[PDB]
C-alpha cells in the first residue's frame, strides 16, 4: 500500500461541469447524439440518424453570413469542425440549412478512404470521451472509420441536461482547434 513507508498515495478528481461558461464542453448520450455545450444555456446536437431532414443539395452559406440572424459562437464551433475535417474534397455530400438563424448541417456518409472516414474522425475527436460507442471502427483502425448510421446532423439546441453516458469534457474540442486548416485541399489558384 504505502511505498517506502512514509509516502502514501492520494488521488485528485476533477469536476469538468464548472467549465461551461469559459469554454465549450462535450458529452455523450443515447449512443448517437453526443451533445455539446457552448455555454450555460444553448449548444449543438451532433446526432447520427438514418433519417434525412435537408433534402436539398444547397447551403446558401454566404446568404447566412449576410443575414446574420444566427448566433456567432455556434457557427464558430461549426467552422472549427469544418476546417478540422482532414482531406475534405466532395461538396455535394454536406447539405446545410442556416435559414432563420438555425444552425443545421447534414454530412452525408454514404473503399474507406472517403469523406465519411474524415468526418467521423473529426466527430470522435470532438466528442473524445464516449465516442467509441458510435464507431464500429476497431482498435488502431484510423484508416477506415465506419458507422451503421448514414448521416451526421449538427443541430442548434437548448441544453436541458443531456449528459447521460459520459461526463462533461472540453478536451476533444480544445485539442481540435489546432487541426483547423491543417489538412485541407486547395480549391482555387489564388486562394
Amino acid at each position: 500500500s504505502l511505498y517506502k513507508g512514509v509516502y502514501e498515495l492520494q488521488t485528485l478528481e476533477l469536476n469538468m461541469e464548472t467549465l461551461n461558461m469559459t469554454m465549450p464542453l462535450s458529452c455523450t448520450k443515447n449512443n448517437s447524439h453526443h451533445y455539446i455545450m457552448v455555454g450555460n444555456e444553448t449548444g449543438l446536437e451532433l446526432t447520427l440518424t438514418n433519417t434525412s431532414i435537408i433534402n436539398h443539395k444547397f447551403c446558401n452559406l454566404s446568404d447566412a453570413h449576410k443575414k446574420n440572424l444566427y448566433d456567432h459562437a455556434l457557427m464558430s464551433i461549426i467552422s472549427t469542425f469544418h476546417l478540422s475535417i482532414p482531406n475534405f474534397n466532395q461538396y455535394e455530400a454536406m447539405s446545410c440549412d442556416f435559414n432563420g438563424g438555425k444552425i443545421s448541417v447534414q454530412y452525408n456518409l454514404s473503399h474507406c478512404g472517403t469523406v465519411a472516414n474524415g468526418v467521423l474522425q473529426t466527430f470522435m475527436r470532438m466528442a473524445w470521451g464516449g465516442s467509441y460507442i458510435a464507431l464500429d471502427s476497431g482498435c488502431g483502425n484510423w484508416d477506415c472509420i465506419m458507422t451503421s448510421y448514414q448521416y451526421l446532423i449538427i443541430q442548434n439546441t437548448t441544453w436541458e441536461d443531456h449528459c447521460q453516458f459520459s461526463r462533461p469534457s472540453p478536451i476533444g474540442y480544445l485539442g481540435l482547434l489546432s487541426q483547423r486548416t491543417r489538412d485541407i485541399y486547395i480549391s482555387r489558384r489564388l486562394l
Binding site: 509516502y7 492520494q10 485528485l12 465549450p24 473524445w128 461526463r167 469534457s169 480544445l174
Partner: protein, 142 residues
C-alpha cells in the same frame, strides 16, 4: 509555441473539484509546472486559473478561448493521448490524477495521470514502475 500562463497563488476547492474539498498544493510542488512541458496537471490548473480570472474580472463569448488555446494549454499532449487511444495503449482522459503524499510535513509530488486501459481505471499493479520512479525520485531532496 509553448505554454506561458502563470499559475496564481494553486489550491483548489469544491467549487472546482468533485469530491474532495480544499485540496491545497505546496508552492514548491506546483513550481515544477514552469519547467516541465509534457504533463496534464499543468494544463488543468492553467484552465482553472483563467476560469477564475474570466468569471471574475470580466463580463459566453468563445473568442477569448479561440485565441489563447496554445498559450493556456498544450494541445499536442491532448493529440498524443488521442493517438494513444487509437493505438489502445493506456491513455489519460484528463479525469483522475494520482500523486504521493506524506503527513509528516505534507510534501507532495506534482500529480501525474491515472492512466485508463480497459475503459476502467488501471489498477496500481500495472503502473507500479512509474509510481516507484516518482517515489525514489522524491527521496532526492538533498
Amino acid at each position: 509555441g509553448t505554454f506561458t500562463w502563470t499559475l496564481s497563488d494553486y489550491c483548489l476547492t469544491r467549487w472546482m473539484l468533485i469530491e474532495a474539498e480544499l485540496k491545497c498544493f505546496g508552492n514548491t510542488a506546483v513550481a515544477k509546472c514552469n519547467e516541465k512541458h509534457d504533463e496534464e496537471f499543468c494544463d488543468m490548473l492553467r484552465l482553472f486559473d483563467f476560469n477564475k480570472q474570466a468569471i471574475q474580472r470580466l463580463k459566453m463569448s468563445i473568442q477569448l478561448i479561440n485565441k489563447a488555446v496554445n498559450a493556456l494549454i498544450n494541445d499536442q499532449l491532448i493529440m498524443k493521448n488521442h493517438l494513444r487511444d487509437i493505438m489502445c495503449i493506456p491513455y489519460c482522459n484528463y479525469s483522475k490524477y494520482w500523486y504521493l503524499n506524506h503527513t509528516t510535513t505534507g510534501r507532495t509530488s506534482l500529480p501525474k495521470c491515472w492512466l485508463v486501459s480497459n475503459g476502467s481505471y488501471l489498477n496500481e499493479t500495472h503502473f507500479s514502475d512509474d509510481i516507484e520512479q516518482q517515489a525514489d525520485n522524491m527521496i532526492t531532496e538533498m
